[PDB]
Amino acid sequence: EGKLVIWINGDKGYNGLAEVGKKFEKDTGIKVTVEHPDKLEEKFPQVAATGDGPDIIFWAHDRFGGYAQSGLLAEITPDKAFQDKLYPFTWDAVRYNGKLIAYPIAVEALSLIYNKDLLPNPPKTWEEIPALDKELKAKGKSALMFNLQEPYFTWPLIAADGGYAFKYENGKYDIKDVGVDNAGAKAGLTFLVDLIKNKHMNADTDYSIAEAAFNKGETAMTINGPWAWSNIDTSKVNYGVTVLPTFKGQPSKPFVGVLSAGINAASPNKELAKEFLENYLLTDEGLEAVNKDKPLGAVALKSYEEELAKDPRIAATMENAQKGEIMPNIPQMSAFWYAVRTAVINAASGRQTVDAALAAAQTNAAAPGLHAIYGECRRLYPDQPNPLQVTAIVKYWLGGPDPLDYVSMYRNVGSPSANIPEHWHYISFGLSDLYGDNRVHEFTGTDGPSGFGFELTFRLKRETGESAPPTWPAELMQGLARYVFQSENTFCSGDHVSWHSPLDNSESRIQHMLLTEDPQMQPVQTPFGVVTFLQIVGVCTEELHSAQQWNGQGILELLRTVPIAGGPWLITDMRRGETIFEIDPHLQERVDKGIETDGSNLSGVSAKCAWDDLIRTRQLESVHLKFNQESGALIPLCLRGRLLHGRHFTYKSITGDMAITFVSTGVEGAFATEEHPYAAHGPWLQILLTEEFVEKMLEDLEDEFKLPKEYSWPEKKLKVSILPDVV
Ligand SMILES: OC[C@H]1O[C@H](O[C@H]2[C@H](O)[C@@H](O)[C@@H](O)O[C@@H]2CO)[C@H](O)[C@@H](O)[C@@H]1O
């Protein structure tokens, strides 16, 4: 046996297609499920990896070339007698690198739908509409309303003056030659932004807002595909479907899309899928059942096409399809669509000028490394297609100071069941290789790290009454990114960073940072390398010191067990006023134990100290070490945490040039022999302590405020005193 699961976008006929699925189950006994998940075009390549996905997937052909290259689609194998049933150009739309990768279903193209009662003669040009809108606003109506959230609906205007996505030149598509940035495209988008300034259209208008407006008669026009006609029938609005308005004398060029059905390559039911598609859905009866639910446009099945051809609504669809351009199916299409999805929104909402919104989409459409990261982000935040975002306006590769080209700011609602608070999630762009053209980072192929190999992320606890994420952390990430770039020393999970300043420039006690693998962002494959995601975690100086004395990983584990200091997701709360050792005093024990068993990472310190006798190599037999109180409290960590693990530890002087290097029995390099344990080169003193003597010395050192204290022995002496160093 086997099941058959189908995905089809919500605006299409999923109920008519379900009827066809019923007839299949009747005649065959195989159950056909139909689902219309949100953002199915993005979710497919996500869950086709785990094969948790549909046996069949429906969408415009432009997406498929991208699926096919990722090996997510099985090649379809119709015989000649079936191929003759559909038009040759619709098989063209589903052909990628020589193979048929999906069955074509229907041809879609945007048309101008107008309310005959409100507007008997629809305007032949775009420029007519501002005028036409004043007349309609007088009697309380509007002239035009259509989806401005999706570039698919505003692209006909942008392309009217000849703006394009990729150029069909010399037999192929030129992937770097994108045309969203030329005069024609700016002329089209400038005109769209104008309409919104003069309040003929509103930037907030999405699909369901426009559809409701037109179907209640509140607006005289709209732009939409054959699928929308069904609901205008139910509204009983007296409407007609016609050619789109011209712009500057040239026609609107809508991207024509062929609704196609592909078969999952991980489907165990490729044969059942071939039967359902070839001998049920693709016939006069099957296509009819889907057309009745929501019109398909001009179907690819020659027979049922000639039957509907009379329908003037179809005639107007193909008239606009002729003036438009058929969408390419190359993998780079999704990139292009996203680049423009943003450009149009930013340019319309006022976030950005038309001239720079399109100049942005130009570099970002071409740019593979950027795309991949956005793809993960969109995997985490499906319902935030346009996040507040900081952009470096003077790019880092034109001499600019700030190396992060972008920093995106998402809203993470957290988890109420697992005690993870609502917070802001920042992701950076530019530490990895975004463009792969040797502009910022050396191109090192698909094998190895992409640029530095990671991007920063940050999770900031949401303060109360905060409508939007603050922007100060984007500044911080610019600071860290500069730190990495200039030094060329990369970071790993567990590393620490001394910042010595409250991260937000308020008095916050959080003044440092540990780094750790972001708990949600998953490493990505890029055509320029691999990109993992490091997350910054704010910490107090007390905690930064623990991480230096013990380890980064160990302290990170602790921040996870104290919810108000990070929790499982290590969220930074900038209003935290207590260290984790003051919240849970019994944690200090865990660290000390962690040091006794793992050992200290601290190889030395710059502190107030000196030594005295009681270039050459002076061999001595009586030594008097002098420390500050602060650096004297270190001595037990030096003994227990390093000399016992067979490691050296060095105190540098900083008031001079003296130094004291404690050396265990049996470490290479070092000139105290233990025939004569106290040798000096210099101001450079090395003193070797046997395990026996270290263990007893630790008993004798118990750190109260008495000074100067002094400890003595048969070997040696050790003072801790106060001002002498600074004087
Ligand atoms: O807007 C970007 C989007 O455009 C196209 O999506 C269309 C789709 O082709 C239509 O059948 C209908 O469902 O409207 C969609 C836009 O809301 C592209 O096919 C798609 O890849 C792209 O992301």
Author numbering: 5 to 618, 701 to 789, 795 to 818
What are the paper's exact sentences on this?
SUFU is an essential intracellular negative regulator of mammalian Hedgehog signalling and acts by binding and modulating the activity of GLI transcription factors. Hedgehog signalling plays a fundamental role in the control of metazoan development, cell proliferation and differentiation, as highlighted by the fact that its deregulation is associated with the development of many human tumours. Here, the crystal and small-angle X-ray scattering structures of full-length human SUFU and its complex with the key SYGHL motif conserved in all GLIs are reported. It is demonstrated that GLI binding is associated with major conformational changes in SUFU, including an intrinsically disordered loop that is also crucial for pathway activation.
The N-terminal domain exhibits the same structure as previously determined, despite the presence of the N-terminal MBP fusion partner. Although the crystallized protein was intact, both SUFU molecules in the orthorhombic asymmetric unit show no apparent density for the C-terminal domain residues 279–360, suggesting that this region of the molecule is highly mobile. We show that in the unbound form SUFU adopts an open conformation in which the IDR hovers over the surface of SUFU that interacts with the N-terminal domain of GLI proteins. Alternatively, it is possible that the IDR has a role in determining intra­cellular localization or that the SUFU IDR may act as an inhibitory module with regard to SUFU–GLI binding, as suggested by the observation that in the structure of SUFU alone the IDR appears to shield the GLI-binding surface of the protein. We propose that the IDR acts as a gatekeeper, which in the rearranged conformation becomes a target for HH-dependent regulatory factors facilitating the release of GLI from SUFU.
